[PDB]
Design a protein around this ligand. Structure first.
Ligand SMILES: [Mg+2]
Ligand SMILES: [Mg+2]
Ligand SMILES: [Mg+2]
Ligand SMILES: [Mg+2]
Ligand SMILES: [Mg+2]
Ligand SMILES: [Mg+2]
Ligand SMILES: [Mg+2]
Ligand SMILES: [Mg+2]
Ligand SMILES: [Mg+2]
Ligand SMILES: [Mg+2]
Ligand SMILES: [Mg+2]
Ligand SMILES: [Mg+2]
Ligand SMILES: [Mg+2]
Ligand SMILES: [Mg+2]
Ligand SMILES: [Mg+2]
Ligand SMILES: [Mg+2]
Ligand SMILES: [Mg+2]
Ligand SMILES: [Mg+2]
Ligand SMILES: [Mg+2]
Ligand SMILES: [Mg+2]
Ligand SMILES: [Mg+2]
Ligand SMILES: [Mg+2]
Ligand SMILES: [Mg+2]
Ligand SMILES: [Mg+2]
Ligand SMILES: [Mg+2]
Ligand SMILES: [Mg+2]
Ligand SMILES: [Mg+2]
Ligand SMILES: [Mg+2]
Ligand SMILES: [Mg+2]
Lengths: 154, 117, 116, 65
RNA sequence: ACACCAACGGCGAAAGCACUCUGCUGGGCCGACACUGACACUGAGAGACGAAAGCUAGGGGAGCGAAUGGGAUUAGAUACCCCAGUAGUCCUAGCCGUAAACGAUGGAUACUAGGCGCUGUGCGUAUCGACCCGUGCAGUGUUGUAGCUAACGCGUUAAGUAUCCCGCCUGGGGAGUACGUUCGCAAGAAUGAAACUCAAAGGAAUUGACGGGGGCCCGCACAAGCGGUGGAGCAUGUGGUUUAAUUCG
């Protein structure tokens, strides 16, 4: 990447709901390129989340992600022979990425039976602000703020 | 404790830390704020940020005494020279004069040698 | 050979030659000195011996020792020596290793203030 | 009493203009470079180095511009 | 101890000399004929001065700081960094006489393009007093012609063209040592070998290679991702051991 920068790729839309968001999630849940299976998983997740609650899942997405989006993190810099944790601020695309990721990881580590169930459970917990995916973000903020003194670009 | 309307703020900025003292024209110290007393230690203790919170922290107690106008005294080469001034400003206290008091010998005591680092 | 170096793998390989007991011990000594002092960094010691000349082939009686070190962080320490006797060769390789080693310790382990 | 730099703030006060007025006062007396200079001790040689360097710097900056 | 002034500026034989002032005094340079009339230049020996460290005696002692001590860092750290801190640094009266005491360039005289600068004065002009201009000297700085040089460079302040006096050099180690003398309170300084050993040791420039020197830029090189190896079992290649042979590569 030393020379070239990256062109933008067409942001797709999930077939049923025509979302950029849901589509993002099905691409990151994907393993061994079986899109066939991933869609099934994601939709039986929408079905368990409409099962447990009567609220619109389309919105529970926006809450689940607004909940886990870090606005800041750190980065290790080498400054004057000193290795600092410098609290670099995060771009929006990067925010959504991070988000979906911690969601998915905390979803893969769950005690439950299905992946649909797990994903639903963590969507529910993240929308409530009640779960590991959120806690993780707050930790990143805690360890950003303690290191707040090392951002000289402040 | 003492309600003094106009007084002076001495801010010493050294390379390892910045001290901010608040006083009155009688040459009397009311309250002080150090970047180390805010729960910062050796490295961070020099950064302009710790100076910011030092300044804010003193001006807390100075509005608590209910003071209005102040002069600012800046002594020393360090980073907080610029940083502290900002907090003095955003802390919504009228700024009368801002002076630099960094002492300059006109000749004198022969300094320490050069560190070979 | 050493216990403080027990974490290190001493791999001794004759290429075209047969390895004796005196070469064993001597290798352990001369490589032992080099490695022992910087042991915290060191990982694997690879020593190959190559003989040539005299009755084997054409050219002077050369005995050539190659060693290789690896450290926990830095890879690739290479040293190549040509000389008369195996013993001489080994002494030389040790002389070189020592230098490169303490050059690495020097770089990273100095708390070198590298500002940039 | 004594003073080096005198910055008097009027009641038109906003933070940035004040901060930069002051910053240019300090640039104007050269006080921070001064206390980086008297931090340690210099033999006559580094004094002649500093004189030639700084003087011919600002001087050639006056003769080019 | 003397900020700013301070300058690729001033005086000094060199060492060096800078807050201010006054006093005693050394030189310099310039313009006039006012005068003497070769009174010159150099210098073996000899004499005076001569950074800093050092020493003797008496004071003085803030800061800094050998030595020294603690704290670290490191395999070690009798170092670098930090915390303390004694001699010494300062003054008076002496000794020591060495420095990259460097322009790494002994002194005097004569003579050989310029250009651009500065310091001192003098002249003419400008006004009638500050410039200003052109010029005469005296010194001081940067480019550069002839010529010189092994090159770099030096170039009216020569390392040019000549004359005079003085000091010094005659391959590298051994060695600026030993021995002996002279000087010194000492530390040491001055004068200065030989046996022996080597076929080199050195200067300037060039192409490389290298640099924990710069500046610019690339690569799934790092970062950002996704999946592996290392752990488990087997499959297989090599080393090692074993064997009559585990063919050689
Ligand atoms: Mg680019
Ligand atoms: Mg510091
Ligand atoms: Mg002169
Ligand atoms: Mg006089
Ligand atoms: Mg006559
Ligand atoms: Mg003589
Ligand atoms: Mg004398
Ligand atoms: Mg002295
Ligand atoms: Mg003594
Ligand atoms: Mg000290
Ligand atoms: Mg010690
Ligand atoms: Mg002290
Ligand atoms: Mg004396
Ligand atoms: Mg001499
Ligand atoms: Mg000489
Ligand atoms: Mg003029
Ligand atoms: Mg002249
Ligand atoms: Mg010259
Ligand atoms: Mg020239
Ligand atoms: Mg010559
Ligand atoms: Mg000889
Ligand atoms: Mg050379
Ligand atoms: Mg290069
Ligand atoms: Mg390079
Ligand atoms: Mg690769
Ligand atoms: Mg590619
Ligand atoms: Mg990576
Ligand atoms: Mg395996
Ligand atoms: Mg064959």
């Amino acid at each position: 990447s030393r020379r070239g920068t990256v062109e933008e790729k067409t942001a797709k839309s999930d077939p049923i709901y025509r979302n950029r968001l849901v589509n993002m999630l099905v691409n990151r849940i994907l393993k061994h390129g079986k899109k066939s299976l991933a869609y099934q998983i994601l939709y039986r997740a929408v079905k368990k989340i409409q099962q447990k609650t009567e609220t619109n899942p389309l919105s529970v997405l926006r809450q689940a992600i607004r909940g886990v989006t870090p606005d800041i993190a750190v980065k290790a810099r080498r400054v004057g022979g000193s290795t600092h944790q410098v609290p670099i601020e995060i771009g929006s695309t990067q925010g959504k990425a991070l988000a979906i990721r911690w969601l998915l990881g905390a979803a893969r580590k769950r005690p439950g039976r299905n992946m649909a169930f797990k994903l639903s459970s963590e969507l529910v917990d993240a929308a409530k602000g009640s779960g590991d995916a959120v806690r993780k973000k707050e930790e990143t903020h805690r360890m950003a703020e303690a290191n707040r003194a090392f951002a000289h670009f402040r | 404790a003492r309600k003094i309307p106009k007084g002076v703020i001495h801010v010493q900025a050294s390379f390892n830390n910045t001290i901010v003292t608040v006083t009155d024209v009688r040459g009397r110290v009311v309250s002080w704020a150090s970047a180390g007393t805010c729960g910062f230690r050796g490295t961070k203790r020099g950064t302009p940020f710790a100076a910011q919170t030092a300044a804010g922290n003193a001006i807390r107690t100075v509005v608590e005494q209910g003071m209005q106008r102040a002069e600012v005294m800046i002594k020393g080469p360090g980073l907080g020279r610029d940083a502290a001034l900002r907090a003095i400003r955003r802390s919504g206290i009228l700024l009368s004069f801002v002076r630099d008091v960094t002492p300059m010998p006109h000749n004198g005591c022969r300094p320490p040698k050069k560190r070979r680092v | 050979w050493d216990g403080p170096l027990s974490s290190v793998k001493l791999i001794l390989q004759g290429r075209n030659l047969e390895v004796s007991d005196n070469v064993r011990s001597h290798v352990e000594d001369k490589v032992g000195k080099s490695v022992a002092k910087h042991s915290h960094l060191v990982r694997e010691v690879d020593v190959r011996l190559s003989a040539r000349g005299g009755d084997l082939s054409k050219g002077p009686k050369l005995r050539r020792c190659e060693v290789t070190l690896f450290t926990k962080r830095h890879g690739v320490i290479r040293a190549e020596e040509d000389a008369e006797s195996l013993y001489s060769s080994i002494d030389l390789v040790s002389s070189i290793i020592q230098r490169k080693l303490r050059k690495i310790k020097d770089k990273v382990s100095d708390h070198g203030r590298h500002m940039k | 009493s004594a003073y080096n730099v005198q910055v008097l703030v009027d009641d038109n006060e906003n933070e940035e203009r004040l901060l930069n007025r002051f910053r240019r006062e300090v640039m104007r007396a050269g006080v921070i470079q001064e206390c980086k200079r008297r931090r340690y001790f210099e033999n006559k040689q580094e004094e002649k180095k500093r004189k030639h360097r700084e003087a011919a710097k600002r001087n050639s900056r006056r003769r080019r511009g």
